Write a structure and sequence with these properties.
By secondary structure, the chain is mostly helical. It has eight helices and no strands. The longest helix is centred in the last third of the chain and has 19 residues. The two termini are 19 Å apart. Keywords: Host cytoplasm, Host nucleus, Host-virus interaction, Inhibition of host NF-kappa-B by virus.
């Protein structure tokens, strides 16, 4: 659309390499604000991890389906989803963390659920510390995403 030179295999390889090259230059508090902003559809694509997330979101390409699905959920089901996905931030699996962030973005794409839950999500994301889990796992996760979603 705007800003991919080549295919998504190249894009994922290249952006995952940029994340590993730059993740030490990004302060944790700034990383977490950038994650919140991505979830709320105010991406800063200059943060390579947020460019990674945006690329993965685009590759998955399920925004319309997940919107319809999330519309069918009640508040109890959404609370369950939020609590379930949030715990990934405290664990050592990056794939789950990336899934959590993207799921939260889908949920914040629903204006009722954004109104109810955006403040608490912003407050709790501020307390996470995921830089080591990104470092340790991003290259592999890039390969796993290529294998699963691309040709």
């Amino acid at each position: 659309v705007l800003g991919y030179v080549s295919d998504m295999h190249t894009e994922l390889a290249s952006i995952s390499q940029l994340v590993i090259a730059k993740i030490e230059t990004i302060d944790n508090d700034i990383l977490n604000k950038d994650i919140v902003n991505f979830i709320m559809c105010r991406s800063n694509l200059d943060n390579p991890f947020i460019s990674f997330l945006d690329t993965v979101y685009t590759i998955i390409d399920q925004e319309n389906y997940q919107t319809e699905l999330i519309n069918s959920l009640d508040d109890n089901e959404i609370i369950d989803c939020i609590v379930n996905k949030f715990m990934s931030f405290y664990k050592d699996n990056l794939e789950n963390i990336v899934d959590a962030i993207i799921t939260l973005k889908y949920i914040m794409n629903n204006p009722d659920f954004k109104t109810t839950y955006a403040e608490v999500l912003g407050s709790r994301i501020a307390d996470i510390d995921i830089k080591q889990v990104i470092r340790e796992n991003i290259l592999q996760l890039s390969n796993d995403i290529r294998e699963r979603y691309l040709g």
